[PDB]
Design a protein around this ligand. Structure first.
Ligand SMILES: [Ca+2]
Length: 463
């Protein structure tokens, strides 16, 4: 299936880096074939990948392929809608330009015009925040290649500043430091004035959502969490936490740091409440059995910057999803342990308990027999999160359970990358690593190569 192959090639870049040998040449071939044969699918995939998977290079390349296909002339409105969905950040159109360069194509008029219109339309402060002045494909290069006719006086001056910087008129240099002086981000208050109780007090009104959550320790170390006006302001902000774009693991990461540092209980309680409320909406239906690897090897950091280890990340995900879908929550190492009787604890407390009670070796097949096979579990979906190494003839007990009922499916997420990302094969889908975007991936993989086309177009065709 070329539709399915292109999907998993794109999705796998979540684990093989956003960004050549086989995967480049196969990507080019599949994207060319599908932009000719099913441009709606290509456009929906680029939207999905940009905005559900958070990927940047693959969707920008898919946009390039649409511009160089029959869809340019036959479906210009689709191409415009797609660029509206894919060119989100100030440098995304630069990624499309970069791909066109990488593959050897001549930059064509329609793409030039689209980039030029984008150069005229991006908010000025965002166009300067993503100058990309030291990249090869910079905003300077884009302006010189696409020749935007400045719509506005300010835009003429922004172009001047971008293309020559120092050598620009002070008429333009001033406006450069003005789109940065007004409406300044909190990062600016702190970088310019430094890091003091008064500078963080000034930053706080501009601290919202994830930026607030991630900067609570800076507030704490300056004593600001004992300031009563700070408390009132953070309570006001957290009263709208339901509207934040934030994953459950980011609340858990904040709480864990609050444990280490001794944050006051009032802020911990706010974070615990926000974590408890953080179940995402999913297309998945039906009770689900989660089987979470908590062997010692899972106690490795998720990444260099994260304060989480893998067992924590996997447990956070499984706990939030099982509270949304219903079903069962098991972990496993030497033995399987059933936590379903404990889902009434807060998510924070349950995950802390799980990870505290984990560690050991990795006996996945034994766990599947205890948890799924011998108990004759009756739900239709199993999700296993593991770092087990590649065994030959793997999950035969799982296949046994999958054949013992109608429409059963399993997803195996291997956080060490020891599996590919694959649509269900013998009713087992596979995910090639860890990602905070696993839910939308499972959703897509569950519809199979037979449903992915209409699934992606009906859900994600650019409007
Ligand atoms: Ca393991």
């Amino acid at each position: 299936s070329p539709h399915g192959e292109l999907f998993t090639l794109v999705a796998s870049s979540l684990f093989l880096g956003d960004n050549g040998g086989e995967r480049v040449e196969r990507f080019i071939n599949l994207a060319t074939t599908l932009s000719k044969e099913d441009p709606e699918y290509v456009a929906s995939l680029a939207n999905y990948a940009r905005n559900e998977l958070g990927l940047r290079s693959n969707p920008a390349a898919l946009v390039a392929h649409l511009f160089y296909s029959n869809a340019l002339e036959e479906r210009r409105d689709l191409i415009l809608a797609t660029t509206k969905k894919v060119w989100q950040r100030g440098d995304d159109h630069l990624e499309t330009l970069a791909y066109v360069k990488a593959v050897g194509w001549k930059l064509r008029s329609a793409l030039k015009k689209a980039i030029a219109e984008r150069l005229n339309d991006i908010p000025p402060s965002l166009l300067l925040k993503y100058k990309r002045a030291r990249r090869v494909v910079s905003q300077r290069l884009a302006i010189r290649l696409t020749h935007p006719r400045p719509r506005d006086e300010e835009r003429s001056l922004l172009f001047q500043y971008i293309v020559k910087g120092s050598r620009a008129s002070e008429e333009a240099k001033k406006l450069a430091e003005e789109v940065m002086e007004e409406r300044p981000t909190w990062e600016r208050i702190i970088s310019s004035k430094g890091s003091t109780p008064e500078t963080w007090l000034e930053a706080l009104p501009h601290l919202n959502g994830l930026s607030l959550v991630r900067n609570l320790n800076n507030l704490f170390k300056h004593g600001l969490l004992e300031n009563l006006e700070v408390k009132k302001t953070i309570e006001d902000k957290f009263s709208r936490s339901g509207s934040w774009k934030i994953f459950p693991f980011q609340y858990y990461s904040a709480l864990k740091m609050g444990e280490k540092e001794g944050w006051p209980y009032w802020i911990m309680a706010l974070l615990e409440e926000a974590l408890e409320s953080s179940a995402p909406e999913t297309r998945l239906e039906g009770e689900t059995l989660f089987l979470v690897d908590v062997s010692g090897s899972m106690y490795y950091p998720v990444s260099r910057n994260s304060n989480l280890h893998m067992a924590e990340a996997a447990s956070v995900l499984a706990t939030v999803l099982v509270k949304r879908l219903g079903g069962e929550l098991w972990t496993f190492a030497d033995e399987a342990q059933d936590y379903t009787g404990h889902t009434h604890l807060s998510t924070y407390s349950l995950v802390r308990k799980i990870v505290r009670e984990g560690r050991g070796g990795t006996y996945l097949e034994r766990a599947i027999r205890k948890a799924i096979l011998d108990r004759s579990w009756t739900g239709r979906r199993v999700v296993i999160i593991t770092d087990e190494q590649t065994h030959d003839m793997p999950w035969e007990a799982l296949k046994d359970w999958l054949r013992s009922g109608e429409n059963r499916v399993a997803h195996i997420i291997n956080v060490a990358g020891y599996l590919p990302t694959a649509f269900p094969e013998d009713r087992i889908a596979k995910v090639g690593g860890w990602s905070d975007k696993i839910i939308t991936l499972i959703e897509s993989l569950e519809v199979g190569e037979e449903g992915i086309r209409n699934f992606l177009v009906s859900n994600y065709l650019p409007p």
